Amino acid sequence: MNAPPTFESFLLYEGEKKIIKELDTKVTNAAIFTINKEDHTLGNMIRNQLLKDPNVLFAGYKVPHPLEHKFVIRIQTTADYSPQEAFMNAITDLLAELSLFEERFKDAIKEKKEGG
Amino acid sequence: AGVLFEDIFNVKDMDPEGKKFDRVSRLHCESESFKMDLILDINSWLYPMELGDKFRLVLATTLREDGCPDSGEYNPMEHEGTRADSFEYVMYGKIYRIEGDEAHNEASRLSAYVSFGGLLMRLQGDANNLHGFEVDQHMYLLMKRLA
Amino acid sequence: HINKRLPTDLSPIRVIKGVKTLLERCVIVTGNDRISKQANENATLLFQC
Amino acid sequence: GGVPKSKRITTKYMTKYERARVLGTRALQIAMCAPIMVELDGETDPLQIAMKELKQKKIPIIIRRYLPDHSYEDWSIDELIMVD
Amino acid sequence: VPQSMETRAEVENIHITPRQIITPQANKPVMGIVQDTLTAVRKMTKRDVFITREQVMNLLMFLPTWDAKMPQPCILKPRPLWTGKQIFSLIIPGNVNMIRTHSTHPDEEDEGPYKWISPGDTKVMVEHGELIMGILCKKSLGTSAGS
């Protein structure tokens, strides 16, 4: 009787922004990005692409509640590079890497089907 | 600059009562120049040792070669180009207690206890060779195996 | 950051004055009466010890 | 039985049983649109206003402490000292 | 549900949980760290637990009282590694100093020469609000007095 709808795990509501940016005040050049209606997949991708960058000093995702489809990433960089630009370069490198994955998988399926 | 202790050590005992931790080795060591005695806790899997080995050890207050203190915070930039490049085992911790003369004993015998997050250091011997050691002072350990 | 291997600057007379001021200022039963004072050192005897 | 101010033998430290009722009564008074003695920093829950004007001890509440011999002592807010 | 907000103020000032931590029955806490949380506290303070930068990085955001100042690692070369006591040190706030013992502490260890350096990591020491020495258990993080 209190069961939530099953489509709320991936659909934003009315007037709900997907990405909310909050400026951290404890240290400098730090920000928190809040993303709704998703899970550990995208946050893990953003984080493990950000961790290869030497320019970042802090990149971390956290899901505050399993029942609330929402996760936050705290990113702090050095004083020559924006955290938002770091996240942009992270998703660009992720898109390039899995585009390479898509084309190598397509070539693998083509050679496996043609080789018999 | 800042090198409070500096000695070569030889290992003489390996787990005198048995190995209780999978990744921690406890070693008993004695020096050659200044007659010190040392009880060592190290990572076993990261940096394995055996009995009878020799290692060069430097106990300093900072990794800066000019003697200036560090910022106290970890960054993944300042670990090369310093005194830590000539050593393969770089620990950072703090002394929690100093035993020996206390108040009512002679100062010919002294001991220092250092905690690296759970790893334990006991450095005991002469008090004049243990100058500069005080309670709640941050400390750097530099260690290199020798042939 | 008290060093236990360095000489201090605390005189014992100041320590005794501080203990006496502590025991005078730590009251439970108030009043200048004899019954009030007797109850004051009866309530705080273990604390004073 | 009005006890004089120099004759008051009760404690000078306000305990939490007085604190809860004075905070609730003052926040209820603010909730019926009383004037607020101190400056407002955007707080909308009047219980928070009740604390942040209890800090400067500017709350017009007289506490009538009842002694067991049916005598009463009146203690003001600023005469009592905050402790937590 | 309180239907008057002065009763809500009474709930805030009296009936709230952190104001009712210590029982007046036996001057002890009534809530404590239990079950697999306590089991992983026991398994996490062990000396052989060497934990990477990525895992303590994962554990960092679940501390909302953190001051955004990460500690320097216990191991600096060749790989930056933390330990369990270093990251439990961030959880403990303020000035906390504490002496107890583990439930598997031998009685002959206290009068021996290893009473301040334990091979078994049994005596539990907390200094200046950061965890230094010992493995935690029901005696240190439970409902017992002096915890």
UniProtKB/Swiss-Prot annotation, chain A:
One Gene Ontology biological process: transcription by RNA polymerase II
Source domain of life is Eukaryota
- Location in the cell: Nucleus
Q: Keywords for this entry?
A: DNA-directed RNA polymerase, Nucleus, Transcription
GO terms for CC?
Answer: RNA polymerase II, core complex
Q: Which SUPFAM superfamilies match?
A: RBP11-like subunits of RNA polymerase (SSF55257)
GO MF annotation terms: DNA binding; DNA-directed RNA polymerase activity; protein dimerization activity
Name a Pfam family for this protein. Answer: RNA_pol_L_2
Report quaternary structure and partners. Component of the RNA polymerase II (Pol II) complex consisting of 12 subunits.
Q: Which family does it belong to?
A: Belongs to the archaeal Rpo11/eukaryotic RPB11/RPC19 RNA polymerase subunit family.
Q: What does this protein do?
A: DNA-dependent RNA polymerase catalyzes the transcription of DNA into RNA using the four ribonucleoside triphosphates as substrates. Component of RNA polymerase II which synthesizes mRNA precursors and many functional non-coding RNAs. Pol II is the central component of the basal RNA polymerase II transcription machinery. It is composed of mobile elements that move relative to each other. RPB11 is part of the core element with the central large cleft.
Task: Name it.
Answer: DNA-directed RNA polymerase II subunit RPB11
Report the source organism: Drosophila melanogaster
Curated annotation (Swiss-Prot), chain D:
Q: Which GO terms describe its biological process?
A: transcription by RNA polymerase I; transcription by RNA polymerase II; tRNA transcription by RNA polymerase III
Its localization reads: Nucleus
- Residues passing through the membrane, by range: none
Where does the UniProt entry say this protein principally localizes? nucleus
Kindly list the GO CC terms recorded for this protein: RNA polymerase I complex; RNA polymerase II, core complex; RNA polymerase III complex
Protein keywords: DNA-directed RNA polymerase, Nucleus, Transcription
What molecular function terms (GO) are annotated for this protein?
DNA binding; DNA-directed RNA polymerase activity
**Annotated family:** Belongs to the archaeal Rpo6/eukaryotic RPB6 RNA polymerase subunit family.
Q: How does it assemble?
A: Component of the RNA polymerase I (Pol I), RNA polymerase II (Pol II) and RNA polymerase III (Pol III) complexes consisting of at least 13, 12 and 17 subunits, respectively.
Q: What does this protein do?
A: DNA-dependent RNA polymerases catalyze the transcription of DNA into RNA using the four ribonucleoside triphosphates as substrates. Common component of RNA polymerases I, II and III which synthesize ribosomal RNA precursors, mRNA precursors and many functional non-coding RNAs, and small RNAs, such as 5S rRNA and tRNAs, respectively. Pol II is the central component of the basal RNA polymerase II transcription machinery. Pols are composed of mobile elements that move relative to each other.
Q: What is this protein called?
A: DNA-directed RNA polymerases I, II, and III subunit RPABC2
List the top taxonomic levels of the source. Eukaryota, Metazoa, Ecdysozoa, Arthropoda, Hexapoda
Full-sequence portion shown in this chain: 47 to 130 of 131
UniProtKB/Swiss-Prot annotation, chain E:
Q: How is it modified after translation?
A: The tandem 7 residues repeats in the C-terminal domain (CTD) can be highly phosphorylated. The phosphorylation activates Pol II. Phosphorylation occurs mainly at residues 'Ser-2' and 'Ser-5' of the heptapeptide repeat. The phosphorylation state is believed to result from the balanced action of site-specific CTD kinases and phosphatase, and a 'CTD code' that specifies the position of Pol II within the transcription cycle has been proposed.
Cellular localisation: Nucleus
**Assigned protein family:** Belongs to the RNA polymerase beta' chain family.
Misc remark for this entry? The binding of ribonucleoside triphosphate to the RNA polymerase II transcribing complex probably involves a two-step mechanism. The initial binding seems to occur at the entry (E) site and involves a magnesium ion temporarily coordinated by three conserved aspartate residues of the two largest RNA Pol II subunits. The ribonucleoside triphosphate is transferred by a rotation to the nucleotide addition (A) site for pairing with the template DNA. The catalytic A site involves three conserved aspartate residues of the RNA Pol II largest subunit which permanently coordinate a second magnesium ion.
Summary of subunit composition and partner proteins: Component of the RNA polymerase II (Pol II) complex consisting of 12 subunits.
Task performed by this protein: DNA-dependent RNA polymerase catalyzes the transcription of DNA into RNA using the four ribonucleoside triphosphates as substrates. Largest and catalytic component of RNA polymerase II which synthesizes mRNA precursors and many functional non-coding RNAs. Forms the polymerase active center together with the second largest subunit. Pol II is the central component of the basal RNA polymerase II transcription machinery. It is composed of mobile elements that move relative to each other.
